[PDB]
Symmetry: none
């Protein structure tokens, strides 16, 4: 039963190989929001668009279950850079979308030395000109 | 005395924007814009055209530096380029984390730019 193909098949996409970033999008898109929340540090912060920051895996999981239904993430490219303090700064561009409409966005992440998410934000990007 | 930076954007117009800003060469910053390109300062109305953009920067951007860190770019089918650069706007000794958004036309002139403030705290 459990001995079978797993979930969240982690495939490198969006030009980023950071495991935590690949797992974030894979778990989100499978609706495995507990697993998404578990990628955050004990005091990691998720900033939903237009909302106050949500702190910690338990509150993040509950937010995603209540508010992220029917939203798929489609990353197209990304870049990760490691700073002097040992953290990793990630940018990912792509689309957030439903079955028939969506929006261009930028996902931003900062990871700690253990590669947990310390905080993430989503920024909107209107279509050109 | 203009000095380039380092990030995920090799685009000359983008590199030039930050270098001319940091040098206080605000007429040259403004010249990177199209004749009807628009600059949106963080909480302000759009300023249209190199003449108005140069005068705004000379008035309100003195002593402000840009330290871009990394960026992404996408080109659409019509030939426009969208650029996102994250970094800090800062003075000699204090700053804030920001995201610069640009749209470039086919000729790589700035059509649009704006600044978005990013999160600084930890509640």
């Amino acid at each position: 039963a459990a001995e079978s193909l797993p979930n969240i098949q982690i495939k490198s996409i969006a030009g980023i190989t950071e495991p935590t970033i690949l797992q974030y999008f894979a778990t989100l898109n499978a609706g495995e929001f507990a697993a998404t929340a578990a990628l955050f540090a004990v005091d990691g912060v998720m900033y939903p668009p237009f909302e106050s920051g949500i702190v910690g895996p338990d509150a993040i999981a509950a937010y995603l279950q209540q508010e992220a239904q029917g939203i798929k993430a489609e990353p197209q490219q990304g870049l990760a850079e490691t700073s002097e303090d040992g953290h990793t700064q990630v940018q990912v561009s792509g689309k957030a979308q439903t079955s028939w409409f969506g929006v261009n966005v930028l996902w931003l992440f900062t990871l700690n030395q253990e590669k947990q998410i310390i905080h993430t934000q989503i920024k909107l990007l209107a279509s050109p000109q």
